[PDB]
Swiss-Prot record, chain A:
It comes from the Eukaryota. It is a peripheral membrane protein. The COPII coat is composed of at least 7 proteins: the SEC23/24 complex, the SEC13/31 complex, SFB2, SFB3 and the protein SAR1. Forms two other heterodimeric complexes with SFB3 and PDR17. Interacts with BET1, BET3, BOS1, EMP24, GRH1, SEC16, SEC22 and SYS1. This is Protein transport protein SEC23. Belongs to the SEC23/SEC24 family. SEC23 subfamily. The keyword Ubl conjugation applies. Keywords: Acetylation, Cytoplasm, Cytoplasmic vesicle, Endoplasmic reticulum, ER-Golgi transport, Golgi apparatus, Membrane, Metal-binding, Protein transport, Transport, Ubl conjugation, Zinc. GO terms for cellular component: COPII vesicle coat; endoplasmic reticulum; endoplasmic reticulum exit site; endoplasmic reticulum membrane; Golgi membrane. It holds the Pfam family Gelsolin. It is found in: Cytoplasmic vesicle, COPII-coated vesicle membrane; Cytoplasm; Endoplasmic reticulum membrane; Golgi apparatus membrane. InterPro entries: ADF-H/Gelsolin-like_dom_sf, Gelsolin-like_dom, Gelsolin-like_dom_sf, Sec23, Sec23/24_helical_dom, Sec23/24_helical_dom_sf, Sec23/24_trunk_dom, Sec23_24_beta_S. Transmembrane segments: none annotated. It comes from Saccharomyces cerevisiae (strain ATCC 204508 / S288c). GO terms for molecular function: GTPase activator activity; zinc ion binding.
Curated annotation (Swiss-Prot), chain B:
The COPII coat is composed of at least 7 proteins: the SEC23/24 complex, the SEC13/31 complex, SFB2, SFB3 and the protein SAR1. Interacts with BET1, EMP24, GRH1, SEC22, SED5 and SYS1. InterPro entries: ADF-H/Gelsolin-like_dom_sf (IPR029006), Gelsolin-like_dom (IPR007123), Gelsolin-like_dom_sf (IPR036180), Sec23/24_helical_dom (IPR006900), Sec23/24_helical_dom_sf (IPR036175), Sec23/24_trunk_dom (IPR006896), Sec23_24_beta_S (IPR012990), SEC23_SEC24_subfamily (IPR050550). This is Protein transport protein SEC24. It is found in: Cytoplasm; Cytoplasmic vesicle, COPII-coated vesicle membrane; Endoplasmic reticulum membrane; Golgi apparatus membrane. GO terms for biological process: COPII-coated vesicle cargo loading; intracellular protein transport; macroautophagy; positive regulation of ER to Golgi vesicle-mediated transport; positive regulation of protein exit from endoplasmic reticulum. Changing R116A: Abolishes binding to and packaging of cargo protein BET1. The lineage of its organism: Eukaryota, Fungi, Dikarya, Ascomycota, Saccharomycotina. It comes from Saccharomyces cerevisiae (strain ATCC 204508 / S288c) (Baker's yeast).
Length: 705, 748
């Protein structure tokens, strides 16, 4: 089924039976593509303590798998992808049903390929000193707490900044020093190299082991930046310069070596390079309106600056994480690419005191069952495909790898295209990517796809995750096709394409595709709206469209430029299950005499005697009806006999806690009720799907050009 | 618990100087004791002084006119061929404990309404004492009541005030004499840490001296702040907390920007503990540096921004030529022809503009250039020269010699322990007819009548050239020097120096009252100005001409008959040393004709141009002491007794004696090659004397001794040999021949 293939390969195709020709694929509207999670965790993943058996075919490089034609007598295997007979290797010349190689017993497997003979993971902390004591103190607390979650052999790096940027030097024991640079200049590698060069750049990066006391003392002694703040001005904060220096130093000594630049900002950059807003408070932070109407004066140079850096770290293969701790914007809209080009974190929080920050930050260092970090580095994903299948592009946190020898690249593109290989400075079990294909064709016919994700494991080994899938191609009209439609997958990839477009009328596109999809798949009588029927397996798509078009990341009405970037960053990273919650939030009703039960996202379900649980993924809200609010508002729950009431108030908090388990980042939790000022969040999410569905039926039965 | 009342309770329970003729040619074996003689008296009748005493007229200690009898008009002055200038010296000692002048605290400063001169001993009280005449512009003024409120009913109360008894005194300035609140002594030690500075040991010394002398550095008001900048290819700052230390590395030498907004210019009191700690580390932090650049220019700018707010003193210690940055310099071509145009002139013009900016924020710069290599003293001097600082040069420094350390360390110690004022402006007012035209010395002046001292040292002398208008209608003329200052104890004071001189139309009188030392100084300063901006020979020619024109004028305008003795060289007794001094000058390191290292010559010229009169002379003509004949009452009085100096001639040196030359810089101990084995030696005496000639309280100088008896000894010899400027040395004539030459020249 749909869940099976995902449970076994972490793969979900929009169409599970591909059309047999490109004309057909176009008449299907929703592209043939899938959402893949290369480092998905399986309770029973097979790891081969050895290298893969690669295909000898010229220009292939595909790896042996379960869909290969194994010839025991001639001891040879045929390649599904490129189709050539290969000499089964020496060790495999004894393949029995009982003696099958590990790679032949599962469609997804991991090989412990070679071992890097190079540097451990690098953690470059870039802290912003222009924040208040309370805020800067609780941040100092977190960073320290994280340090004890890191591999003792991890290279640490430290830069503090505000008016100027200070690169700390931990290699000095005599006196703790640090090289200072101008927060108002755009230093260049050559210039920065000379200035910083016992002489080597590799002295600003040292093993946590041989430095944990110094670095701890140093972090315990940080104090707010102490320059003067004029009349009505914002502090001078040269983030732009800090990120420039940071990425340059790393390029200077650790190019193409896993590094993770972790920025902690408390406000927008108020100094060029990368200036988001001027210091004078009378200058407001741009809004979507301003950006849309070319009135956002600093925005274009900013984006143009940060993109320069993003291309750098992505090309050099370094990660950039951005944690914002403040009520106002810091410029995530302009700095976003830093995080999307690389597999970086992007978290918007009001303060470094928030649970959202604390829990999310420490969660980034979560470990697997072997006790190693879940994060992975220097990921490289290559998509091999049969000859009757091409690649259109990827939509996720990666960068295209060019000059490849691949021959399966489509002329048409979607997302990051013109290639079938991509790269991620950082990735993790929580990263999913949308790969879009094109039917190259212009007796069972099959198409094969193989995902080869080579990357660097936290255990310090290089591995190769392989997933191979097979999909049948059928003629225009075959019932199987319409049945192989995964409407949850289709909706997520379509939203993915929508965010990509919007990041580069999108709703007009959403509406047209929906109408075109229904015209083809709905059964009805021309010019007879009320006869419109969609099979149970398509019946949800329209609803998903309905919600998507008015979600947090497409219709950025009541959103600040940064909220939008935030929401979108997460959305183009998360999986099918969670992406849906982002599109169509969930609402569960709880009561004294019933079991938790799903309700329509409308006011109807706002009742006195019940408790509601709304899941926006970014938010988890628990609204208590008047009655229950009152009962809870004083007593009962604490009364032995009213143990049933107590369980009622607890059910929404357990489901809540179960959602929060493994989610990243952590959503903002909200406990409200009828009358509470936050109740708006719930209501501000309750024209109607009814009207939508009606107008939809009228167009689906009518003819277009 | 006792109230103020219970405390008081329990407790209660005219003689115009004459001309004395001499024959320079007979005056051979130059008296030389004369060099100690005080100048001709200033003939002033008790009548011209409100309260006649020895203090009613300016002592030679503070001011010395080159003329103690002023020509009554410009014509007479011009004919005299004599210079008119004032050798000024506001302070007498390094420490303001020794001999402070009388200080008024009253807060009342009585001044003229017109000329703005200050009340003084030579004022005249008119109209039943209700008013006073300005001896400077003669305008009647109203005598303030506060002048008499001293002894309410005793009319003779005034005459007890310092501004009436003394020609030299000070006042505690009233509120209006301050715009900003007097500054706290602020220091900024910019130290070279490059490779050279480490190899020489120059650093360990500097850090040690400072470390052991933090107590010596002034802090009367206890507000003394301090800063430290270690410099090489980069500028290193240091955050110093009150009683953690961090070092801030800044290698972007393009624009001066500061690392942080505070804890760099710290309270010497409240942060001593930490400052000592930091000092302790520095030698380690740089224990082994391979860097060979010294960014003085950049560091200097940073320092300007670092202490420019309050203003202060940047003290530079370096063993490296400026290497990297704004004012980097290079070794020069090395001369004789136009060695001024090339070896003495300032290379990069950053060093002159920087002093112009320092005037805006009241910063002064001092330099201690200690090294075996070129430092380009010539062009760096400009820093201290125009900011009232001083440039100290230590040739051939290297810890390899236990003495380099003692000299440098001792001098540097004295320099930081010396007092100084801040925001000081010095000004001189002349009576009707007298006008201040040129001003020589280390300070800032572009606006006549006013010299600006971002800070004022205690070990320098200044010179003001004066012009006698057209004519002076009175029998006396006056000159008043005023110094408005902010003393290093948060006090705004005003130090005044008033000098009264008799006028005269008698050329005989003019000459009879000439201060040969002041005059020697006047030409010294005029020649140091030439050597540095014009030609070096233009200077040498200037010094000779000065001696020529004077001998020529005397002979022609004063001498009465050629019938005198036997073809003598006529002059007066009070100028008996002048020709000898000028000649020695031409043989000095700063003017020699020949080969002299760009730095040595530059350092010499800088020395001469700012040395206090007392030492300027010992420098030109050294004090030689024959110690084998030496009296027996010498050795001790707690002041050690000294021998009578002999002539600076190779002659007097007996091939078996012991001598001690002292030229103000070095100290030679020449022992005849054939002396009694009493060499083994009394020893307390010789050691005592040398200690004497070194320990001074008015300058920082530390005399480096040089003992002498096939090449080394030959050099020490030729060198010590050149300090005796009376002989024929450096291919330059002998003193006897000098007079012989001059005579011929002036003779028809
Ligand atoms: Zn193949
Ligand atoms: Zn007057």
């Amino acid at each position: 089924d749909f869940e099976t293939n995902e449970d076994i390969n972490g793969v979900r195709f929009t169409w599970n039976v591909f059309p047999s020709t490109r004309s057909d694929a176009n008449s299907n509207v929703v592209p043939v593509g899938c959402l893949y999670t290369p480092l998905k965790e399986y309770d029973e993943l097979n790891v081969a303590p050895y290298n893969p058996v690669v295909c000898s075919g010229p220009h292939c490089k595909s790896i042996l798998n379960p869909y290969c034609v194994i010839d025991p007598r001639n001891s040879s295997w045929s390649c599904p992808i490129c189709n050539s007979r290969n000499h089964l290797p020496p060790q495999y010349t004894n393949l029995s049903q009982e003696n099958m190689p590990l790679e032949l017993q599962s469609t997804t497997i991991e090989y412990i390929t070679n071992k890097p003979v190079t540097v451990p993971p690098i953690f470059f902390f870039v802290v912003d000193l222009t924040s208040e004591t309370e805020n800067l103190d609780s941040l100092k607390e977190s960073i320290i707490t994280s340090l004890s979650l890191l591999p003792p052999n991890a290279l640490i790096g430290l830069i503090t900044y505000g008016n100027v940027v200070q690169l700390h030097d931990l290699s000095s024991e005599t006196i703790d020093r640090c090289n200072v640079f101008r927060g108002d200049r755009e230093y260049q590698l050559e210039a920065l190299t000379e200035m910083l060069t016992p002489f080597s750049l590799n002295r600003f990066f040292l093993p946590l082991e041989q430095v944990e006391f110094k670095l701890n003392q140093l972090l315990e002694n940080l104090s707010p930046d102490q320059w003067s703040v004029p009349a009505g001005h914002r502090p001078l904060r040269a983030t732009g310069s800090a990120l420039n220096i940071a990425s340059l130093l790393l390029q200077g000594c650790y190019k193409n070596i896993p590094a993770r630049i972790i920025l902690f900002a408390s406000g927008p950059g108020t100094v060029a390079p990368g200036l988001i807003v001027n210091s004078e408070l009378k200058d407001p932070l741009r809004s979507h309106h301003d950006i849309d109407s070319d009135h956002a004066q600093h925005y274009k140079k900013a984006c143009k600056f940060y993109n320069q850096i993003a291309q750098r770290v992505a090309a050099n293969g370094h990660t950039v994480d951005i944690f914002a701790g403040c009520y106002d914007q810091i410029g995530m809209s302009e700095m976003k690419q830093l995080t999307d080009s690389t597999g970086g974190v992007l978290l918007l929080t009001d303060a470094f005191s928030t649970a959202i920050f604390k829990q999310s930050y420490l969660r980034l260092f979560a470990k697997d069952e072997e006790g190693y970090l879940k994060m992975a580095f220097n990921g490289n994903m290559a998509v091999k495909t049969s000859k009757d299948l091409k690649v259109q592009g990827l939509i996720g946190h990666a960068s295209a790898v060019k000059k490849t020898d691949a021959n399966n690249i489509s002329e048409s593109e979607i997302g990051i295209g013109a290639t079938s290989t991509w790269k991620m400075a950082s990735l993790s079990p929580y990263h999913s990517y949308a790969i879009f294909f094109e039917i190259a064709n212009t007796r069972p016919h099959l198409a094969y796809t193989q995902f080869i994700t080579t990357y660097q494991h936290s255990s310090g080994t290089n591995r190769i995750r392989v997933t191979t899938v097979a999909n049948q191609l059928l003629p225009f009209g075959t019932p199987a096709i319409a049945a192989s439609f995964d409407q949850e997958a289709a909706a997520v990839l379509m939203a993915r394409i929508a965010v990509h477009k919007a990041e580069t009328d999108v709703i007009r596109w959403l509406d047209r595709t929906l109408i075109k999809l229904c015209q083809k798949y709905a059964d009805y009588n021309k010019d007879d709206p009320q006869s419109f029927r969609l099979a149970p397996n398509f019946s949800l798509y329209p609803q998903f469209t309905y919600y998507l078009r008015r979600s947090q990341f497409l219709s950025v009405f009541n959103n600040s430029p940064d909220e939008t970037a935030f929401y979108r960053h997460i959305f183009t990273r998360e999986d099918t299950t969670n992406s849906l919650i982002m599109i169509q939030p969930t609402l569960t009703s709880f009561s004294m005499e019933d079991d938790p039960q799903p309700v329509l996202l409308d006011s109807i379900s706002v009742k006195p005697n019940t408790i509601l649980l709304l899941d926006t993924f970014f938010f988890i809200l628990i609204y208590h009806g008047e009655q229950i609010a009152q009962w809870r508002k004083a007593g009962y729950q604490d009364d032995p006999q009213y143990a049933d009431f107590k369980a009622l108030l607890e059910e929404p908090k357990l489901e809540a806690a179960e959602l929060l388990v493994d989610r990243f980042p952590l959503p903002r939790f909200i406990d409200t009720e009828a009358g509470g000022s936050q109740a708006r969040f719930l209501l501000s999410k309750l024209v109607s799907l009814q009207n939508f569905m009606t107008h939809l039926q009228q167009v689906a039965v009518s003819g277009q050009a | 618990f006792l109230t103020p009342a219970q405390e008081q309770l329990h407790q209660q329970i005219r003689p115009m100087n004459q001309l004395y003729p001499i024959d320079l040619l007979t005056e051979l074996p130059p008296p030389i004791t004369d060099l100690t003689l005080p100048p001709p008296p200033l003939v002033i009748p008790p009548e011209r002084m409100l309260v006649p005493s020895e203090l009613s007229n300016a002592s030679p200690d503070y001011i010395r006119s080159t003329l103690n009898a002023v020509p009554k008009n410009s014509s007479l002055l011009k004919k005299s061929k004599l210079p008119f200038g004032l050798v000024i010296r506001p302070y007498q000692h390094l420490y303001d404990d020794i001999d402070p002048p009388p200080l008024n605290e009253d807060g009342l400063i009585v001044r003229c309404r017109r000329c703005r001169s200050y009340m003084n001993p030579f004022v005249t009280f008119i109209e039943q004492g209700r008013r006073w005449r300005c001896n400077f512009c003669r305008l009647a003024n109203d005598v303030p009541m506060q002048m008499d409120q001293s002894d309410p009913n005793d009319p003779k109360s005034r005459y007890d005030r310092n501004e009436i008894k003394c020609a030299v005194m000070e006042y505690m300035a009233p509120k209006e004499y301050t715009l900003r609140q007097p500054p706290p002594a602020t220091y900024c030690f910019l130290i070279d840490v490059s490779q050279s500075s480490i190899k020489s040991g120059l650093l360990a010394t500097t850090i040690n001296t400072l470390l052991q002398n933090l107590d010596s550095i002034p802090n009367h008001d206890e507000r003394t702040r301090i800063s430290i900048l270690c410099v090489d290819n980069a500028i290193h700052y240091f955050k110093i907390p009150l009683d953690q230390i961090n070092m801030m590395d800044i290698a972007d030498l393009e624009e001066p920007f500061l690392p942080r907004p505070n804890s760099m210019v710290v309270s010497l009191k409240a942060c001593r503990q930490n400052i000592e700690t930091l000092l302790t580390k520095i030698p380690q932090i740089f224990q082994s540096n391979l860097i060979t650049n010294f960014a003085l220019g950049p560091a200097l700018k940073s320092a300007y921004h670092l202490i420019g707010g309050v203003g202060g003193k940047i003290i530079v210690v370096s063993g490296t030529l400026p290497n990297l940055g704004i004012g980097k310099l290079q070794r020069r071509n090395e001369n004789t022809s136009k060695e001024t145009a090339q070896l003495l002139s300032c290379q990069d013009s950053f060093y002159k503009n920087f002093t112009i900016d320092c005037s805006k924020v009241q910063i002064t710069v001092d330099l201690f250039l200690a090294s075996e290599d070129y430092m380009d003293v010539a062009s760096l001097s400009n820093l201290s020269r125009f900011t009232a600082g001083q440039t100290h040069f230590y040739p051939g420094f290297s810890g390899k010699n236990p003495n380099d350390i003692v000299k440098f360390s001792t001098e540097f110690a004295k320099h930081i322990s010396m007092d100084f004022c801040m925001e000081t402006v010095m000004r001189a007012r002349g009576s009707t007819g007298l006008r201040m035209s040129r001003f020589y010395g280390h300070f800032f002046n572009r606006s006549s009548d006013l010299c600006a001292f971002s800070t004022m040292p205690r070990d320098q002398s200044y010179l003001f050239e004066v012009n006698v208008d057209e004519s002076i209608m009175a029998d006396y003329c006056y000159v008043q020097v005023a110094v408005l200052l902010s003393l290093n104890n948060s006090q705004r004071r005003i130090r005044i120096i008033t000098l009264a001189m008799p006028t005269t139309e008698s050329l005989a009188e003019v000459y009879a009252s000439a201060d040969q030392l002041a005059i020697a100084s006047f030409y010294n300063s005029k020649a140091v100005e030439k050597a540095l901006n014009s030609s070096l020979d233009d200077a040498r020619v200037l010094i000779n001409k000065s001696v020529q024109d004077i001998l020529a004028t005397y002979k022609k305008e004063i001498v009465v008959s050629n019938t005198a003795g036997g073809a003598p060289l006529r002059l007066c007794a009070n100028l008996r040393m002048f020709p000898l001094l000028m000649h020695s000058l031409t043989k000095h390191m700063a003017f020699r004709s020949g080969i002299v290292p760009s730095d040595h010559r530059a350092s010499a010229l800088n020395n001469l141009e700012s040395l206090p009169l007392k030492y300027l002379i010992k420098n030109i003509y050294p004090d030689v002491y024959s110690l084998h004949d030496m009296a027996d009452e010498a050795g001790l009085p707690g002041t050690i007794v000294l021998p009578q100096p002999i002539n600076a001639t190779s002659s007097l040196f007996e091939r078996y004696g012991l001598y001690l030359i002292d030229n103000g810089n070095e100290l030679f101990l020449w022992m005849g090659g054939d002396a009694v084995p009493a060499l083994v030696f009394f020893n307390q005496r010789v050691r005592n004397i040398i200690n004497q000639l070194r320990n001074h309280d008015d300058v920082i100088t530390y005399q480096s001794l040089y003992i002498v008896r096939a090449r080394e000894v030959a050099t020490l010899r030729l060198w010590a040999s050149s300090t005796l400027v009376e002989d024929k040395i450096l291919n330059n004539e002998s003193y006897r021949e000098f007079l012989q030459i001059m005579k011929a020249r002036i003779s028809k």
